[PDB]
Amino acid sequence: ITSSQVREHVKELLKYSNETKKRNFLETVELQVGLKNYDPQRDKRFSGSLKLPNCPRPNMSICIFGDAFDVDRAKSCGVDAMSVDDLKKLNKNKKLIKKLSKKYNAFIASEVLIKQVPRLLGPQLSKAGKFPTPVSHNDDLYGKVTDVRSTIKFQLKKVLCLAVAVGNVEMEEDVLVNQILMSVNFFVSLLKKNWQNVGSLVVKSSMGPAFRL
Amino acid sequence: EVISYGPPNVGANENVFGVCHIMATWNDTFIHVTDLSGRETLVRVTGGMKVKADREESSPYAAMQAAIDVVNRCKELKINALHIKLRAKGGVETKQPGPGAQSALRALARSGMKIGRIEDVTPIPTDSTRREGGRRGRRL
Amino acid sequence: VNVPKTRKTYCKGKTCRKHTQHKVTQYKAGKASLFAQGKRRYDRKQSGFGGQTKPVFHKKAKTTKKVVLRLECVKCKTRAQLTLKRCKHFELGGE
Amino acid sequence: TQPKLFGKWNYDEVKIQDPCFQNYIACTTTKSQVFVPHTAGRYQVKKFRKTQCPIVERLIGTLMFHGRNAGKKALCIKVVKNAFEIIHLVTGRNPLEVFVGAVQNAGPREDSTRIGTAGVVRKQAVDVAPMRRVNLAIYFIIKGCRESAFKSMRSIAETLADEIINAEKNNTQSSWAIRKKDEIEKVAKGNR
Amino acid sequence: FTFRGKGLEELTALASGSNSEKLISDELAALFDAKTRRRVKRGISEKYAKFVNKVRRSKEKCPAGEKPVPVKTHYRSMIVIPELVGGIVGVYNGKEFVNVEVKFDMIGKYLAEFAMTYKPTTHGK
Amino acid sequence: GVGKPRGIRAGRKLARHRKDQRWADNDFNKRLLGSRWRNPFMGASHAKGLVTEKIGIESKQPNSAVRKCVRVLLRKNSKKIAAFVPMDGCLNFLAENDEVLVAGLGRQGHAVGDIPGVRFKVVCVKGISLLALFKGKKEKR
Amino acid sequence: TLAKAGKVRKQTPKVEKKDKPRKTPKGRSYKRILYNRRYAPHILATDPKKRKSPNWHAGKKEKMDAAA
RNA sequence: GCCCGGAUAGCUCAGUCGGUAGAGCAGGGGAUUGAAAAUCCCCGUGUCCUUGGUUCGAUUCCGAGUCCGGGCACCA
């Protein structure tokens, strides 16, 4: 709870383990948070790294599609399909628009809708996990998929999600919790007023918990 | 459950007493209940609290509702028996009970209630003072 | 009298120059109280009694202030440039 | 053997459960069990003869009641027969055991007597009699049929049929009959 | 460029035909409405014949100065005969005699149909 | 006893009482108060006069009629008099300014039921009894 | 009015009086005749309740002869 | 010139701590009626002043605008 105990989630919580000495192999810590919890559309992000610094952790197939040319916008990589003859029948509704825009990351496709997005395609999907975000959709979905694959930084969109990092095993305290904060930027604060907008969260590394608030 | 307030003493053979004052005018009717010392008011229901039209502020109906309304409130005070002090603006006015009189009592008896002694306390004066109207009074 | 919010009124700044659409509001007011030299000295009377100062102020107005047109580009990045239209009463873009 | 109504409707298929209506209705009698609702009887002679009238004869009567158009039982016996066929094709019940119920329901139990004194129009609480109750019930039922039945392709044997049904149900939204049945009591419950 | 019913002349030959006996030869009969035919075929009066000739003299003797000698009559029941066209007959109505110029159109119609018998109503109060 | 006192010594009383209680009589009260002398004739039975003008007066209540009347000026008295000219043509003889002899009609006071404020009768014109002028064979000037 | 004076008399047709056939005895004679025409014993003779009116002879020539 | 309150049905006005717009009167339709009232049922219309942002949405929440209402203080 943004208090002294931050370094109790960090410093005092960095060698908890669950057995004997402390092992003999590398470490793996971070600092959990989110993306903005807005609705993955209107406003929740912009630009600027923390860091932070990371990438996947497990899988990365997100979202990118629109026309017959959006497939190759997911061929030399791996993404979801919006289909062509579906935006007039079933390419969006609940578990539909989901499918294409409901993965884990967010979305990195382009744009093309017309008079249909106030309760179907572009619509039903927003806070679900996608609704047309900033993925430099013009050359494709790879270069700006540096904001959708690796490096990172920590593009935090769709539904929660983000990253963190600072050191290895044991050598951080005030800058461990203050490294977790450092592992937060346009995700912990931003422009006009943004020093906080949530309730709680989690964190650790592999040991056991962090802040007991 | 419920947190009654009648003194800490029950018994389907232990009578509780509440003194019910009833003033029955030809305009409005009152029904009051109070300690047998009459210095601490409990229940107070008047025909006015029972209807919309000022003319009905008397009524046999208003007496029923104001009457039954009190009995319910009374079972909660844990009181079952009521002493009746019946009046009717004695002063220098028709020393005759109103209409919502025999109506009020009747309602208390029907809706359960036990009835203690019954008095008539319309204040009859020894002298008098120049009544309503004058010399000739209500004409027409 | 119907002005039109932003209209390419050439202008400059510079570090810009040429034209540039300018979002053009009219000018408002501004409090002073307890900063103004006007105050720093005009706090007096002198002082167990007073009056004011020779110009204070009951004269005879004109019944027509002036539009403090405040044109301001966004590319020129600067700087909110004032203009002066004179004729009241009126109001922004109708039209 | 038992003479069914219109040739196909057992009378003993019904019984009057409530004691009120027991003597103020016709289903119950041996003499009442008629094939045809036409008796050219001599009811309306003593001051209670009306009773002994085979409930439906009464319905037919109250039915041929609009001026010019009416005054001919001949036909009315029809409008009532078809209506019974039609009521059957919907609830397949002994349509007398329907019309009968309806009669018991559509009769207001309370009315207000207009007693005015010097301009002011006051009213009192009055309990409606049985004979009066049935009379009102039928009068009411039929009353409504014509209501819609007018400039409508819907026919009396249909309007009436549709009525006798809901009138039994107490469906306050589908029976011009029961509407008043309720209102009369309501307004009456106010004046009381 | 206007004409007349059935040829004013054919009728003068039709009426005064070979047998110009009864004022209304059975010829003219074929022309009139049932009511008129009824009357003639029934019992028409002779006076109606001497009245006839009275118009006759009025139509010729008068110079082309178009000034016909008005013939007076109460025979409002007379049905204009073809040869009766052109003359101005004064017909009684109730007060006086009415002068009417007989046009070809008023034939087969009752001579009374023109002698207004009452002055309809004007108004005010 | 009754109101009146019956004493042989109380004559005086009864006497004064009668003289007093007697004023309640109009006939008495009348002549006693020299009233007769104040009327237009000054008590007199008849009076001479000059015709001031012949005027007509309307009948009262159930009657409607033009009564013949002469306004006269009494001689020594000098008062305006209302005088009813009798019978039919009568007023046709009374010339304005002539001398007339007048007398009352049934007890000096109420005029004949018909008349309004007239209290006198005309009996002579230029000193010629009216009756005389009323019957041809008698007199005329 | 005024000019309406004696309207009646002026309008009346002056009828003349029947020039005395003979004479009317004036003196004890008249009182005598009367005595005879009425209080003479032949009239006091017939009922005093059924004797005629001293002027029923309104001058009626038809009833004048019937009596005499 | 500051400081409070409002903007809703034709009128006067309620009104979630974001999910519905509601009274009372007028107006109208009907029963009742000597007359008129009072009664007694049934209805009628709403960018909830405007413009944007918060939210899945918002009469409501916040900024700003215009207006009306309140108040309080000066005025050479």
Added chain:
RNA sequence: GCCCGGAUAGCUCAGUCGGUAGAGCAGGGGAUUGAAAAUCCCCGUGUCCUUGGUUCGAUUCCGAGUCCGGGCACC
């Protein structure tokens, strides 16, 4: 002579913001009465003073005038 205020249905007076115009009384026709009143239902009414001008449109906004009103004319 100067400065003010109106005028609208038959009458007394409402209203408008530039689109609409009203009420009360009167009145016309039925109803109650034996018949009139009263009362009860039904109904019709407007150069918004004349006047030019503006305006797409004027009872309404200007300019002139008529009438009926009120108010000043002091040293």
Added chain:
RNA sequence: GCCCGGAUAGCUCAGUCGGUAGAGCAGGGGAUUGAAAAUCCCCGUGUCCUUGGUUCGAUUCCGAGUCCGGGCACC
């Protein structure tokens, strides 16, 4: 004495930016009543005060007199 004003039938009284003369009451003939009041239709009655002008004509629009009719009169 100058400033406005009315003059119209038997008596009291109005007039398209002239061209025509009116109710009222007296009044006589009716309708009405039992008769009458009241009332409703009808009759009638005149240089619209005398002059001069304007016009095709003036009772009216003009100009003076005229009679009676409200407002102005040493120092």
Added chain:
RNA sequence: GACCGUCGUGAGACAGGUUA
């Protein structure tokens, strides 16, 4: 100097009336 009326918050002001 002093009454009143009438205008004026006041001071006063009336080609108003009244008196020495």
Added chain:
RNA sequence: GCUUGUGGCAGUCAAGCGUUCAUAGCGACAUUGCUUUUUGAUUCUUCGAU
């Protein structure tokens, strides 16, 4: 003090009144004037005495 509109006062022409006749006695319209005890303009003289 000018000026004289306004006041007042006379005057020409003669259509009219004057019952007959324009002028005995008066005169519409139109027009020429005198007057400075009205009144109105004007501000020259006099508040550094009327």
Added chain:
RNA sequence: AGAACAAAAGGGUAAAAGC
């Protein structure tokens, strides 16, 4: 060229200066 040229009045203005 009697209209029109924001608005007062005047000038001006016709393949226009008006639309």
Added chain:
RNA sequence: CCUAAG
């Protein structure tokens, strides 16, 4: 008074 009445 005119965003076009520039």
Added chain:
RNA sequence: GGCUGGGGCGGCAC
């Protein structure tokens, strides 16, 4: 304050 057929009350050709 002023302009004012002399000052003034008035009016604004201030």
Added chain:
RNA sequence: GCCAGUGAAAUA
């Protein structure tokens, strides 16, 4: 739990 998720808005 969540990839499924409805509803006025999903949580360890």
Added chain:
RNA sequence: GCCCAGUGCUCUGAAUGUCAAAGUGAAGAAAUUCAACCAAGCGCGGGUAAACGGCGGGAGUAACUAUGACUCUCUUAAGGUAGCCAAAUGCCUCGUCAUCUAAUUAGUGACG
């Protein structure tokens, strides 16, 4: 006599809105600048005229004629009450009728 709306005066009164200095909170690094509450007073409520003073206006409106106790009205607290006059208040005014004179812009008595 009637008017408490106006101006004044004056009462515990008003469930609520302003309202200064100190005192309090919030923000800067302070200076300082925003806040909230805050006595009176104000404004809201009441009484008050032998307190200042006030005291309307137009339409219709039969039994020749003119007429108003009649009603209609639009209307501000209230709409001049007893009483009283051409009066020391009255404009027109030398008011109109008397009266006193030969005669009255004087007197006096009337009338509104």
Added chain:
RNA sequence: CACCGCCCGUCGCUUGUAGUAACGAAUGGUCUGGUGAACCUUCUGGACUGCGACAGCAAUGUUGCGGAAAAAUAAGUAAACCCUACCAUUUGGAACAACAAGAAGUCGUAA
């Protein structure tokens, strides 16, 4: 002529009337304060005249005495007149006003 009956007052209208009190005048009478004709009486006065004595016989004259006209006088009776109060009897007066009587005037409805 029987409630569509009776009926009251304000105001108005129509036709009329001059009362009571006061005042004015007229006639008469009385009081108050004065002026005061005339006449009875009174004190005067004494033309004129009668007587006696003396101047002459006489007209006349002186004086004494007596009667006695005008004049004048005081107190008195007191006419008329005036003034100051009061009584009686008559008679007078007006616009507006007032009173009287009447009605299917007007407004309402008291009884």
Added chain:
RNA sequence: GCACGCGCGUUAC
């Protein structure tokens, strides 16, 4: 006889 105002009725929605 027709601008209309009443009263029996006939036919009908």
Added chain:
RNA sequence: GAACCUGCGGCUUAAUUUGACUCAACACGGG
């Protein structure tokens, strides 16, 4: 209330014959 019908009033008309007027006149005078 509607259109006709028929009676009464009214207003017309040469003339619109006249009786009857709250039930106790008006399709009533056999209209």
Added chain:
RNA sequence: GGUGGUGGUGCAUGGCCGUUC
């Protein structure tokens, strides 16, 4: 001087009829 008269007075009247019933 009559006849005749759907000409006038139903308040001059018979007769008759309506109403109170």
Added chain:
RNA sequence: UCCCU
């Protein structure tokens, strides 16, 4: 049934 007539 006596409210209305």
Added chain:
RNA sequence: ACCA
């Protein structure tokens, strides 16, 4: 007559 009103009540239904």
Added chain:
RNA sequence: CGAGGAA
């Protein structure tokens, strides 16, 4: 004329 207001 679409079942008809005060009566």
Added chain:
RNA sequence: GACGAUCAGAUACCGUC
């Protein structure tokens, strides 16, 4: 006297003072 109401009218019959 001041007010409500009732009435076509009510400074009257009721009602608040």
Added chain:
RNA sequence: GAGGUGAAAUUC
């Protein structure tokens, strides 16, 4: 909510 009336209304 009283009060008050046939109903209500100023009144508390």
Added chain:
RNA sequence: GGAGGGCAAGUCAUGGUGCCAGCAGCCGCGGUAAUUCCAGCUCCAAUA
């Protein structure tokens, strides 16, 4: 000097008049068929 009543006397089917002229002591007569007006006739009363 009267003839409806009081108050004696016309029950004339009389003429004129039409609430007009007039009568009438008091009741009341009179508004087209007046027993009271005007007048004729006949009557009554007191009778130089």
